[PDB]
Amino acid sequence: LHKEPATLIKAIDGDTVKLMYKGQPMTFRLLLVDTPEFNEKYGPEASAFTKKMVENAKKIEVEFDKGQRTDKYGRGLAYEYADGKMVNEALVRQGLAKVAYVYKGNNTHEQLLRKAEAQAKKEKLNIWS
Numbered sequence: 001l002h003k004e005p006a007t008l009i010k011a012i013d014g015d016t017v018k019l020m021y022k023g024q025p026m027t028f029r030l031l032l033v034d035t036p037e038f039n040e041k042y043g044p045e046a047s048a049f050t051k052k053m054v055e056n057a058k059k060i061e062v063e064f065d066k067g068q069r070t071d072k073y074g075r076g077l078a079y080e081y082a083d084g085k086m087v088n089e090a091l092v093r094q095g096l097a098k099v100a101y102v103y104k105g106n107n108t109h110e111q112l113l114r115k116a117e118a119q120a121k122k123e124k125l126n127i128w129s
């Protein structure tokens with residue numbers, strides 16, 4: 001897999017974001033994770049987390065997996081990085097997302113995220129408290 005550039009257009013919530021990619025505005029849905037909706041417990045915390053991580057970064061990148069690049073709603077499916085640090089993994093590590101929606105052929109970073117979740121659960125963080 002390889003990283004590609006993008007720039008923030010606007011934060012949305014824990015697992016979606018509006019980015020410009022190849023010069024076009026797109027809503028991205030982060031691969032392999034599920035954050036609570038804003039309406040839910042830890043929703044606002046997830047959204048604040050990704051809003052901060054992505055607004056403070058100098059360099060946003062997206063990395064597509066080997067499978068579908070867009071979902072049925074036209075959302076881009078990617079791993080997002082903020083100054084080299086994967087937002088999808090950071091959410092999981094902090095107990096602000098569950099590993100979820102693991103489809104075959106778009107699951108390159110599955111084990112990486114599961115290891116993060118195991119550590120979040122150990123530490124009883126947020127969703128796991």
Ligand SMILES: Cc1cn([C@H]2C[C@H](OP(=O)(O)O)[C@@H](COP(=O)(O)O)O2)c(=O)[nH]c1=O
Pocket residue numbers: 015029030031032033034071072077101103106
């Ligand atoms: C993360 C992800 C979600 N989806 C679809 C499945 C879910 O369909 P339904 O809308 O039918 O439940 C929806 C979940 O996204 P949200 O968790 O953002 O709602 O997005 C994919 O198709 N591929 C993916 O990789």
Ligand SMILES: [Ca+2]
Pocket residue numbers: 015034035036037
């Ligand atoms: Ca969600």
